[PDB]
Ligand binder design. Structure first.
Ligand code: CLA
Ligand code: CLA
Ligand code: CLA
Ligand code: CLA
Ligand code: CLA
Ligand code: CLA
Ligand code: CLA
Ligand SMILES: CCCCCCCCCCCCCCCC(=O)OC[C@H](COP(=O)(O)OC[C@@H](O)CO)OC(=O)CCCCCCCCCCCCCCC
Ligand SMILES: CC1=C(/C=C/C(C)=C/C=C/C(C)=C/C=C/C=C(C)/C=C/C=C(C)/C=C/C2=C(C)CCCC2(C)C)C(C)(C)CCC1
Ligand SMILES: CC1=C(/C=C/C(C)=C\C=C\C(C)=C\C=C\C=C(C)/C=C/C=C(C)/C=C/C2=C(C)CCCC2(C)C)C(C)(C)CCC1
Ligand SMILES: CC1=C(C/C=C(\C)CCC[C@H](C)CCC[C@H](C)CCCC(C)C)C(=O)c2ccccc2C1=O
Ligand code: SF4
Ligand code: SF4
Lengths: 164, 73, 72, 80, 144, 73, 41, 741
């Protein structure tokens, strides 16, 4: 109960929706022989379904009046009430990989600018240079702040403009 | 209530796009750089690429993640 | 039609219509004062945007008024 | 009629005249480039404004420049 | 040597069965444009109005409604056939006007004596702002 | 749903201002057409040259913003 | 086969190998770790 | 020998060295990128072989081996459909009950919840219900086991490898010379004789010896593992004489010309098999026998190496009259020296074939248990009409490519083509008139019915209970084709289809086919079709005839087939090329064929399809086509709104992917309107403003970002428009008809 909400292990619409999905799977299962190949896949779907409900109720997700889990996207209401794995932990688990790709592509461009003709190594990617920059880009925030402290991250007004 | 809200919201949308339309007519017909040496109206054109690129970033982020969460649901 | 089709298809169509009018018997008597050309490029934009906006507003106005005042 | 002006960035490579579908343009003696020649627009009454001249100009920020003006029966390109 | 040739309609037309792309009432009321060329041999050329005609040996005369049709015909006669055509301008009151090679020399070659109209002795980035040309009577470009 | 649609509204507002601010600031010129102020506010194009210049004017950037405006409203 | 390895290093071939790699990594993850809505432990 | 094999040994060395160099085919693209337009020109100019080189021999070699590439891909595709029919299907179950078991041949992997798409298709099986009709083909061929499907899938892989090896051989190792390809008389004799004639003779052999006895034992009612295998039907004449008692006489009635004794298994029944709702396979057997004899006669027409036969140049140059000048002179030399002129005619007649196939496979359903599978019927009609309409627009495109590139005024003086160019204004003006006439007198009838139904005046409408517009001519043709077994085809036991009149064939409680009444709404929709087909002809033929010149641009052929414009001048010249005309004709082919497939999907659901109880048969939509398709609001309510009520609530079921694509193709379609409405000079300046941001953070690419080309953005817009509209209608149709059909 952060903003009119309720834990999903407490709310009854969540359990009613679990029983609704298991009821649809059960009346779907009632047509087949108990050991046939469709019935095995239907019971495996039931097992994945029940494991999904158990692990959404276990992590302390907040349900609403609809019986559906919600995501508190504010630190200080996620850190204080234990919901940092909703948004606040994957908002850095994403940005590590985002700045990773943005650093690997940056360094692949800068390490191919100073050649004979760079464009041929942009349609035909130099794979050993690409995999070297793929592995050694693991510490990208480190190298990014060390590049920002120089001023070698930005370029000055050598850039191309029109008519200011 | 539905008619009045939708009425004044489309009136406001057309008037707000025409605000920028006549703001674009200003820079062609009325703007003088030698009369506007260094003011806010010239610094606006000076970093116009930063303005358009940051609006492009905000729009591209909002569309990527709004459409992504809707298609996900 | 004003948005996807652009002017130059239509000028080539209007030239064949000018041919058909200026070679038809007894319609040669009737002649224009303004030479028929297709709508210009900026004009094609404005006409397509005008029909787009008028159809947009009339569709949603009919839907809004009927959808609210039908059940209420 | 359309406004066809040229500018002194002309290198005299006479490509606008060959690109012109209406003989608006022609090459005039001049002493501002190596080719000793510059274009001219004496016949802008016949111009339609199709801008083939400034698809063919090699100089960065084109030396020929067509400004779409009033439209007569020759500027609209009419056989009728 | 060369001084402004004249025209007679006595010169034949190339053999052409007639298309629907020919002249209109603009030819009879406003103007129509005639083209002449001397051909060396009888050969087939594409009409700018659609269709193929065969030109005959000697002088030819063919009439169009646009200057672009006549200059397109000169463009394919000078390139594919290496001929030297010239087209004129005929008004319905019989007044004829020499239009193509004014000085005899084709316009992509310097004749040393034609005058440079519509030239700006300045760079195109050095145009004034439109605020400086405002209220010039009519609406006006900064290139003037 | 109101989270998602307020971010849809923010997408629409930022994209409509992207089109309108880009039309107002590039109204005087761009790298594709450095003398756009010489042609005025409303003009078709600058021809097929330089890659093609369909919808290059500031009028034609108001124009594309009316669609995103009607979308937003 | 040096020319074959330069063909293998072109843009669409690297694109269709790397996208199958990053597809069939996330697909094996969502097989062995079903339904990750929230960062658990 | 004038007609002889003539090749060149080892013309092109097989090496991966040119795979390393993209753009090797083009003189301009071989220098590499400097600009992102390069990589779109790489894929756009990839198969335009006529612009790579000028040697017609090299062009013909490239297009002859590219056809082996397409054939290898089709054999991979067919072999995959046989393999997915073998290993992932309920076809074994479907053969025992082909009325309550849905045909399924695609199973998904249970990962992200997509295993809900493995629906309960029946027969102890879960998968996606297919609608491509392969199971009805396989029953009509006499398959009866997934072993035969697996082995013909292996044969399809072998034949795909044969096709790929063949293209490699006939391009790299032993490639044919130019005057090999120019033997069109030999190509027509071999294709009418060997492809069409011997192929239908061979399918006649398979139908006589394999599919007639197997399907007769199926229709009598025998388990498929109890049926003799077809090699036991070849070897044992006693089983075939038990099934058809004239196999005891052998091939003696064929050579004594006592062919009437073969009337046990070559029939002229007509109508439908009432056991299964398909055509009689004895009737299709005699069909392919007669087709085989006809095309083997037709393939001995043209002169190749002996003095007998016709030569097509002498056929063309003889057919000339007083009205048409020199007649067909010169058409042989342009249909032998131009591949685009061939591809125009072939795409035209082949896309007409697809539509004739689509109309001839609903009314005369040729497969067992095809007609009561309503989903297969709807998807086959829709599929083949779309393939036909695309091929007709490609005909209109490649005719104009011939006009721009390969047309020569020297070879064409006062023939048919020159005289058509010289009255193109009359052609396009009269077609403009008839399009405007058809538009008013077809769509204004719908606007009139809208207005009268809205103004409270239903008596003043155009309907059956109002001002009637009866299709007297089509009704008269229906009467004559229903009375054709009386005196104009006296050896027909029934009419050639059930649409002409009579009773209904009912299979499994569902109507296979019943007679189709043609009323006022049928009149109005057939004139909507005539209108939209004439407008598509107007646009495509205006692009062909004005491909080289017009009064607007007299030198359009120097600008090319695919050019954006000739600038803003002379009023504006946007979209003046022939490419832009086939661009605009693609929208009208979409417009026409969407109404064609809507008229099918609502005429069949209203007046043909539905369950029968032998108690006054109740159709699917209750019989509201003639009663409610008078108005645009009737097509809105009772067709789009009413029948979208199964694609919109398909979530949480096996049809839910159709619920997703119906949204997604609503996306892509509207996404196309970003490309169709906007223009390049916007996006190039937006790319400048973000190239600045990539310059500021040192991440500007060396291949410089450009906006899409004008005729590229038009191509992207029309491609996304067609995809998003056709896939919307795809998902709508299939989610409707799998559920309620
Ligand atoms: C869009 C900006 C924004 C807004 C409107 C709020 C809104 C709020 N924050 Mg918050 N917050 C934000 C950004 C924001 N936060 C950021 C970026 C951080 C740092 C990571 C925090 C850290 C934070 C803490 C640590 C706390 C809040 C608290 C609060 C609440 C008072 C209110 C719901 C407080 C709270 O729990 O409510 C009483 C509280 O203790 N916030
Ligand atoms: C206080 C309000 C106001 C004022 C005084 C002006 C004044 C001006 N504007 Mg501006 N403008 C405004 C609001 C305003 N605008 C708004 C709100 C918008 C956004 C829609 C615009 C968008 C705009 C553009 C894009 C342009 C102008 C231009 C102009 C100038 C010329 C006017 C003109 O072309 O008239 C003539 C106007 C018309 C003939 C209007 C066309 C008809 C429209 C499309 C309505 C059609 C709807 C239809 C009738 C509905 C019927 C339905 C049917 C079924 C019954 C003038 C200085 C132009 C300019 O300066 O040129 C350089 C120019 O290019 N304005
Ligand atoms: C449904 C139609 C539609 C859609 C989706 C868009 C989308 C967009 N427009 Mg708009 N636009 C439209 C119609 C549409 N427009 C119309 C009708 C017009 C009038 C011509 C315009 C005029 C217009 C202008 C003038 C501008 C935009 C801009 C934008 C962008 C805004 C940034 C954003 O939201 O990025 C989010 C991206 C998306 C929502 C689409 C991406 C879809 C997915 C995520 C991509 C990947 C899917 C998948 C992997 C691909 C597989 C393909 C294949 C392999 C099978 C975005 C690309 C602006 C822009 O460029 O901003 C930078 C801009 O300046 N548009
Ligand atoms: C063009 C024809 C075609 C098409 C569209 C498909 C499509 C498909 N096949 Mg198939 N297949 C084909 C030809 C085709 N096949 C042929 C010719 C063979 C014989 C070699 C097979 C043998 C085959 C097998 C053995 C299996 C499939 C499977 C699949 C499915 C998943 C494929 C996958 O995940 O890729 C895998 C990704 C990469 C290879 C990378 C998909 C529906 C799978 C399936 O349906 O599972 C239920 C499966 O197990 N296919
Ligand atoms: C009776 C002989 C015969 C037969 C059956 C064919 C059959 C075919 N020809 Mg063809 N052709 C022939 C003689 C023959 N040709 C002659 C004599 C010439 C020279 C004048 C040509 C010149 C020619 C050209 C230029 C082209 C064709 C093409 C085609 C294919 C059309 C596509 C189709 O319907 O796929 C139907 C598919 C099948 C029938 C699958 C069965 C495949 C069989 C086994 C191969 C075809 C029979 C083959 C000719 C026998 C030779 C065996 C080989 C070992 C020598 C088709 C396979 C086109 C094509 O697609 O090329 C690949 C094409 O571009 N033909
Ligand atoms: C290319 C097609 C083709 C092929 C390969 C065969 C092949 C065969 N037929 Mg057959 N047949 C065909 C077309 C074909 N037929 C057609 C079109 C008809 C209808 C006129 C027949 C009518 C027919 C009869 C009536 C009989 C055969 C028989 C036979 C078998 C021996 C032929 C013989 O005695 O010498 C052989 C398996 C004989 C047999 O024993 O078959 C089981 C036999 O009695 N056929
Ligand atoms: C619903 C949208 C719509 C409509 C009505 C039209 C209408 C038309 N298109 Mg068109 N088009 C459209 C969308 C549309 N288009 C789109 C989206 C594209 C994009 C690719 C095109 C591309 C296109 C091309 C490329 C061509 C056409 C052509 C035509 C004309 C053929 C029909 C005709 O003459 O019949 C008569 C007119 C109608 C059926 C329109 C409705 C009139 C109703 C029935 C009655 C009249 C109203 C009544 C008198 C009341 C008047 C009230 C008073 C106050 C004025 C017509 C002007 C063709 C053409 O002009 O040549 C013939 C042509 O070549 N269009
Ligand atoms: C269809 C009725 C058209 C009459 C018909 O079938 O063709 C009659 C006539 C055929 O002309 P000939 O009898 O000279 O035919 C010689 C042909 O073999 C082609 O050279 O064709 C023409 O006069 C042009 C037809 C277009 C006429 C436009 C009318 C629409
Ligand atoms: C929190 C709050 C508050 C506050 C509020 C505020 C502060 C607001 C503000 C707001 C704002 C602050 C707004 C603004 C807006 C703006 C706008 C809307 C603008 C626009 C612009 C434009 C449109 C432009 C135009 C132009 C151009 C284009 C360029 C140049 C020229 C011109 C200028 C014309 C209070 C406490 C009171 C209360 C409670 C709540
Ligand atoms: C994951 C991802 C994402 C997202 C994405 C999205 C958002 C998408 C969407 C999309 C949409 C929003 C829509 C779509 C749609 C699609 C479609 C729609 C497709 C289609 C295809 C096809 C292939 C088709 C086919 C067909 C049919 C079915 C019909 C007719 C026939 C044919 C064959 C043509 C992100 C960015 C986050 C990141 C990266 C990745
Ligand atoms: C949006 C739009 C553009 C902009 C579209 C740009 C130019 C292309 C869109 C991006 C393409 C898809 C390239 C992005 C993918 C690259 C290949 C990089 C791939 C990186 C990884 C995914 C491998 C136009 O250029 C245009 C031109 C004419 C009329 C309308 C429009 C138009 O509407
Ligand atoms: S403009 Fe370009 S082409 Fe015309 S003259 Fe100057 S340089 Fe030669
Ligand atoms: S194509 Fe570009 S340039 Fe040519 S006319 Fe259309 S808009 Fe103007």
């Amino acid at each position: 109960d952060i903003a009119g909400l309720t834990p999903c292990s407490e709310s009854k619409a969540y359990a009613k929706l679990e029983k609704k999905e298991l009821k649809t799977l059960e009346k779907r299962l009632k047509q087949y022989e108990a050991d046939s190949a469709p019935a095995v896949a239907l019971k495996a779907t039931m097992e994945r379904t029940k494991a999904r409900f158990a692990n959404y109720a276990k992590a302390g997700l907040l349900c609403g009046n609809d019986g559906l889990p919600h995501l508190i996207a504010d630190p200080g209401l996620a850190l204080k009430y234990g919901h940092a794995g909703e948004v606040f932990i994957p908002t850095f688990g994403f940005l590590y990989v985002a700045g990773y790709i943005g650093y690997v592509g940056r360094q692949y461009l800068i390490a191919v600018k100073g050649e004979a003709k760079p464009t041929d190594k942009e349609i035909i990617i130099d794979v050993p240079l690409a995999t070297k920059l793929a592995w050694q880009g693991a510490g990208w925030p480190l190298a990014a702040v060390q590049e920002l402290q120089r001023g070698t991250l930005l370029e000055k007004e050598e850039n191309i403009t029109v008519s200011p | 209530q539905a008619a009045l809200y939708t009425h004044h919201q489309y009136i406001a949308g057309f008037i707000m796009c025409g605000a920028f339309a006549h703001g674009a007519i200003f820079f062609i017909r009325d703007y003088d750089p030698e009369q506007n040496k260094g003011n806010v109206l010239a610094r606006m054109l000076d970093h116009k690429e930063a303005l358009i690129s940051h609006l492009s970033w905000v729009s591209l982020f909002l569309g990527f993640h709004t459409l992504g969460l809707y298609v996900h649901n | 039609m004003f948005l996807i089709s652009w002017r130059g298809y239509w000028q080539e169509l209007i030239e064949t219509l000018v041919w058909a009018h200026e070679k038809t018997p007894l319609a040669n008597l009737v002649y224009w004062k303004d030479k028929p050309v297709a709508l210009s490029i900026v004009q094609a934009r404005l006409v397509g945007l005008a029909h787009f906006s008028v159809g947009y507003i009339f569709t949603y106005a009919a839907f809004l008024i009927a959808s609210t005042s039908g059940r209420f | 009629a359309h406004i066809v002006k040229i500018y002194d960035t002309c290198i005299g490579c006479t490509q606008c005249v060959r690109a012109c579908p209406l003989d608006v343009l022609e090459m005039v003696p001049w002493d501002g480039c190596k080719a000793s020649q510059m274009a001219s627009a004496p016949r802008t009454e016949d111009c339609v404004g199709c801008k083939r001249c400034e698809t063919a100009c090699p100089t960065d920020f084109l030396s020929v420049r067509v400004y779409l003006g009033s439209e007569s029966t020759r500027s609209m390109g009419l056989s009728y | 040597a060369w001084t402004v040739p004249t025209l007679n309609p006595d010169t034949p037309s190339p053999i052409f069965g007639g298309s629907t792309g020919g002249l209109l009432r603009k030819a009879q009321t406003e103007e129509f444009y005639v083209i002449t060329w001397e051909a060396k041999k009888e050969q087939i050329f594409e009409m700018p109005t659609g269709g193929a005609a065969i030109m005959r040996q000697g002088p030819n005369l063919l009439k169009f409604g646009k200057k672009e049709q006549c200059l397109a015909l000169t463009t394919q006669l000078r390139n594919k056939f290496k001929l030297t055509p010239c087209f004129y301008r005929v008004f319905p009151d019989g007044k004829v006007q020499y239009l193509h090679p004014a000085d005899g020399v084709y316009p992509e070659k310097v004749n040393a004596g034609r005058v440079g109209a519509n030239q700006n002795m300045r760079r195109i980035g050095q145009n004034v702002n439109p605020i400086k040309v405002k209220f010039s009577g009519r609406m006006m470009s900064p290139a003037e | 749903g109101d989270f998602l649609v307020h971010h849809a509204i923010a997408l629409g507002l930022h994209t409509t201002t992207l089109i309108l601010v880009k039309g107002a600031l590039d109204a005087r010129g761009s790298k594709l057409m450095p003398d756009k102020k010489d042609f005025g506010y409303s003009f078709p194009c600058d021809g097929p040259g330089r890659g093609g210049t369909c919808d290059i004017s500031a009028y034609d950037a108001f124009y594309l913003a009316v669609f995103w405006m009607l979308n937003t409203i | 086969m040096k020319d074959f390895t330069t063909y293998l290093s072109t843009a669409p071939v690297i694109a269709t190998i790397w996208f199958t790699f990053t597809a069939g990594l996330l697909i094996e993850i969502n097989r062995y770790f079903p339904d990750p809505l929230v960062f658990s432990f | 020998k004038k007609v002889k094999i003539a090749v060149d040994r080892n013309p092109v060395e097989t090496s991966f060295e040119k795979w390393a160099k993209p753009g090797h085919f083009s003189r301009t693209l071989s220098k590499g990128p400097n600009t992102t337009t390069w990589i779109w020109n790489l894929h756009a100019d990839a198969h335009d072989f006529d612009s790579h080189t000028s040697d017609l021999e090299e062009i013909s070699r490239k297009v002859f081996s590219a056809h082996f590439g397409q054939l290898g891909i089709i054999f991979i595709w067919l072999s995959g459909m046989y393999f997915h029919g073998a290993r992932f299907s309920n076809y074994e179950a479907w053969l025992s009950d082909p009325t309550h078991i849905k045909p399924s041949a695609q199973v998904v992997w249970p990962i992200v919840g997509q295993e809900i798409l493995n629906g309960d298709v029946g027969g102890g099986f879960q998968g996606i219900q297919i609608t491509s009709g392969f199971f009805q083909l396989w029953r009509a061929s006499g398959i009866t086991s997934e072993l035969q499907l697996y082995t013909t899938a292996i044969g399809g892989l072998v034949m795909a490898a044969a096709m790929f090896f063949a293209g490699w051989f006939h391009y790299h190792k032993a490639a044919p010379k130019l005057e090999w390809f120019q033997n069109v008389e030999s190509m027509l004799n071999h294709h009418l004789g060997g492809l069409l004639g011997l192929g239908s003779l061979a399918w006649a052999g398979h139908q006589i010896h394999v599919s007639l006895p197997v399907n007769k034992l199926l229709d009598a009612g025998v388990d498929p593992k109890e049926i003799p295998l077809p090699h036991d039907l070849l070897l044992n004449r006693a089983i075939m004489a038990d099934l058809y008692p004239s196999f005891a006489k052998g091939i003696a009635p064929f050579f004594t010309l006592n062919w009437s004794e073969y009337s046990d298994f070559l029939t002229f029944k007509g109508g439908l098999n009432p056991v299964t709702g398909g055509l009689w396979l004895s009737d299709t057997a005699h069909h392919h026998v007669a087709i085989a004899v006809l095309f083997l006669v037709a393939g001995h027409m043209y002169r190749t190496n002996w003095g007998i036969g016709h030569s097509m140049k002498e056929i063309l140059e003889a057919h000339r009259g007083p009205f048409t000048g020199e007649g067909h002179v010169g058409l042989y030399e342009i249909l032998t020296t131009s591949w685009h002129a061939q591809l125009a005619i072939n795409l035209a007649l082949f896309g007409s074939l697809s539509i004739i196939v689509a109309h001839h496979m609903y009314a005369m359903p040729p497969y067992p248990y095809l007609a009561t599978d309503y989903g297969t019927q709807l998807s086959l009609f829709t599929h083949h009409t779309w393939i036909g309409g695309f091929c007709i627009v490609g005909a209109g495109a490649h005719a104009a490519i011939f006009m721009v590139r390969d047309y020569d005024p020297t070879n064409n003086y006062n023939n048919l083509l020159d005289r058509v160019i010289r009255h193109r204004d009359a052609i396009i003006s009269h077609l403009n008139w008839v399009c405007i006439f058809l538009g008013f007198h077809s769509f204004g009838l719908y606007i009139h019915n809208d207005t009268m139904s809205a103004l409270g005046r239903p008596q003043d409408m155009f309907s059956d209970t109002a001002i009637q517009l009866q299709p007297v001519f089509a009704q008269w043709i229906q009467n004559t084709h229903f009375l054709a077994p009386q005196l104009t085809a006296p050896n027909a036991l029934a009419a050639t289809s059930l649409t002409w009149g009579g009773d209904l064939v009912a299979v499994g409680g569902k109507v296979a086919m019943m007679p189709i009444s043609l009323g006022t709404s049928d009149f109005m929709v057939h004139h909507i079709h005539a209108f939209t087909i004439h407008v598509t002809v107007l646009i495509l033929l205006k692009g062909v005839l004005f491909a080289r010149s017009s009064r607007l641009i007299p030198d359009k052929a120097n600008l090319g087939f695919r050019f954006p414009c000739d600038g803003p001048g002379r009023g504006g010249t946007c979209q003046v090329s022939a490419w832009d005309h086939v661009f605009l004709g693609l929208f009208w082919m979409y417009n026409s064929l969407s109404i064609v497939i809507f008229h099918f999907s609502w005429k069949m659901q209203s007046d043909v399809w539905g369950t029968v109880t032998a108690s006054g048969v109740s159709h699917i939509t209750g019989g509201n086509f003639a009663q409610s398709a008078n108005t645009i609001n009737g097509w809105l309510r009772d067709f789009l709104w009413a029948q979208s009520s199964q694609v919109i609530q398909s979530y949480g079921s096996a049809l839910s992917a159709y619920g997703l694509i119906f949204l997604g193709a609503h996306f892509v379609w509207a996404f196309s309107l970003m490309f169709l409405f906007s223009g390049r000079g916007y996006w190039q300046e937006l790319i400048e403003s973000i190239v600045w941001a990539h310059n500021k953070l040192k991440v500007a690419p060396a291949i410089q970002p450009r906006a899409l080309s004008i005729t590229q953005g038009r191509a992207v817009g029309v491609a996304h428009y067609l995809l998003g509209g056709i896939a919307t209608t795809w998902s709508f149709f299939l989610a409707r008809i799998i559920s309620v059909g």
